[PDB]
Amino acid sequence: ASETTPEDWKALAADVRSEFQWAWQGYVAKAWGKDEINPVSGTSRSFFIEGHDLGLSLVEALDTLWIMGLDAEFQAGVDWVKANLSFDVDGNAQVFETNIRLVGGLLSAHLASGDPVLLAKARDLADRLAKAFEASPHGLPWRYVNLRTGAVSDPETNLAEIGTYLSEFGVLSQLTGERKYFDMAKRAMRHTLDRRSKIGLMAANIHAMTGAFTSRNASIDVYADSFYEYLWDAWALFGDEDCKRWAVECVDAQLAHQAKRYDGRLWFPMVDFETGAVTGTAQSELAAYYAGLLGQVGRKAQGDDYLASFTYLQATFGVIPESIDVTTGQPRRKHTGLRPEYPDACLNLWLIDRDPRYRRLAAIHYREMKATSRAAFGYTALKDITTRPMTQDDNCPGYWWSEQMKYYYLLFSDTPRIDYGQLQLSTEANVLRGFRKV
Numbered sequence: 161a162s163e164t165t166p167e168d169w170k171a172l173a174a175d176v177r178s179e180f181q182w183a184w185q186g187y188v189a190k191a192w193g194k195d196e197i198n199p200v201s202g203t204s205r206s207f208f209i210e211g212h213d214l215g216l217s218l219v220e221a222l223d224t225l226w227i228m229g230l231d232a233e234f235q236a237g238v239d240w241v242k243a244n245l246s247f248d249v250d251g252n253a254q255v256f257e258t259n260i261r262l263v264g265g266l267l268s269a270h271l272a273s274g275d276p277v278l279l280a281k282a283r284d285l286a287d288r289l290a291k292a293f294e295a296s297p298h299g300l301p302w303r304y305v306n307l308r309t310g311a312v313s314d315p316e317t318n319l320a321e322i323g324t325y326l327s328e329f330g331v332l333s334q335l336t337g338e339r340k341y342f343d344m345a346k347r348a349m350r351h352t353l354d355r356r357s358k359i360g361l362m363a364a365n366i367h368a369m370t371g372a373f374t375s376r377n378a379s380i381d382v383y384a385d386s387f388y389e390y391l392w393d394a395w396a397l398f399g400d401e402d403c404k405r406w407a408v409e410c411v412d413a414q415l416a417h418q419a420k421r422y423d424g425r426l427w428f429p430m431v432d433f434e435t436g437a438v439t440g441t442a443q444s445e446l447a448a449y450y451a452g453l454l455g456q457v458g459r460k461a462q463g464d465d466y467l468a469s470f471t472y473l474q475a476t477f478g479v480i481p482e483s484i485d486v487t488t489g490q491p492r493r494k495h496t497g498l499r500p501e502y503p504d505a506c507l508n509l510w511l512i513d514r515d516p517r518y519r520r521l522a523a524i525h526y527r528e529m530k531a532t533s534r535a536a537f538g539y540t541a542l543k544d545i546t547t548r549p550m551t552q553d554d555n556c557p558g559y560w561w562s563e564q565m566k567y568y569y570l571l572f573s574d575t576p577r578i579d580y581g582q583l584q585l586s587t588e589a590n591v592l593r594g595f596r597k598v
């Protein structure tokens with residue numbers, strides 16, 4: 161007869177904040193200044209350069225701490241950065257990961273606080289990454305660069321690793337007045353878009369020196385994914401008319417040639433970029449970001465249909481498998497990366513009309529994370545989703561500190577610290593617009 165008791169969303173937001181503060185205390189105790197905590201053993205690891213940590217998880221956490229009103233914790237992290245974080249290091253850093261995690265994490269912390277030193281450090285790092293773009297006659301970045309010397313390595317790259325810079329670099333250009341950052345990021349994206357096939361698709365794999373594709377596989381998934389996000393995000397952040405056009409053209413080519421149904425559910429397998437023949441049967445969990453991008457570009461019904469494929473994986477397996485075979489619906493791997501893309505899609509679709517269904521689905525995902533990944537000193541990736549209980553690995557990935565706890569808190573809290581109508585998030589969930597003073 162009566163309804164089951166309605167969710168108290170403010171109480172659930174307070175629980176997310178409590179858990180985030182508890183995890184931060186574990187990082188301070190076991191991994192202070194180090195890149196990642198291993199929260200089962202209570203130890204740390206490096207991410208970018210073995211033996212030369214750069215405070216990765218501390219930097220990733222900063223904007224999340226501020227949004228939650230964890231102000232003492234935020235200021236302790238900012239003060240560590242200002243005293244300790246140098247990028248004058250004789251070692252190789254992966255250009256893509258360094259931009260989205262460290263340049264973006266310093267920019268969101270700068271926008272929250274106003275502190276000039278955080279902008280100075282973001283810009284210093286971007287100038288070291290610029291050497292990877294300058295080493296290509298096409299302006300396509302090499303995958304790795306030595307932060308001190310500018311030496312490059314590995315030009316056999318991909319759309320995500322040449323095309324996930326324009327949000328962070330374009331905000332640098334706005335704040336500093338120097339257009340060079342925006343221009344270098346946009347030039348790399350134009351290169352691959354100019355090489356689209358007659359059916360409107362790009363292959364995912366590209367060589368920085370020849371400028372030619374090195375496979376025939378078009379993908380929406382890993383090695384391509386965030387290129388398509390950053391086309392739309394550059395329209396939203398900068399008003400760039402080329403990027404607005406390109407975002408819509410690329411998505412409608414993918415809907416025409418990659419959207420396929422298997423057992424009644426929508427998937428986007430890999431296809432030959434010229435002929436449209438299917439070339440893969442795998443889909444990763446990370447492809448769930450695309451449900452939210454579909455809604456952003458004006459394809460909400462199709463975005464909700466794709467989200468439903470992942471909702472069915474969550475209801476069936478509890479945790480979404482890291483990879484599935486689309487022809488059967490069954491897992492290709494048993495381990496996970498404590499991945500954030502399902503609540504990413506839920507937040508992006510919820511920002512359109514505030515439909516409470518997206519809150520219900522994200523609450524299932526948060527509660528499942530608490531039931532499976534909680535460890536002695538924080539939250540961990542999984543070894544095997546098929547055992548009962550699910551067995552645990554021993555690592556908290558840096559992106560956990562920027563992404564899913566922020567997504568849950570934004571969905572549940574209605575915080576006055578954010579202007580929800582102006583909110584813009586990077587592919588690492590760094591807030592690049594929408595802070596309100598308080």
Ligand SMILES: OC[C@H]1NC[C@@H](O)[C@@H](O)[C@@H]1O
Nearest residue numbers: 386446499500559587588
């Ligand atoms: O899976 C989370 C991981 N995926 C690649 C990036 O887009 C970002 O979401 C994060 O580093």
Ligand SMILES: [Ca+2]
Nearest residue numbers: 386449587588
């Ligand atoms: Ca992402």
Ligand SMILES: [Ca+2]
Nearest residue numbers: 389585586587
């Ligand atoms: Ca996005």
Ligand code: NA
Nearest residue numbers: 220223265562
């Ligand atoms: Na962050």
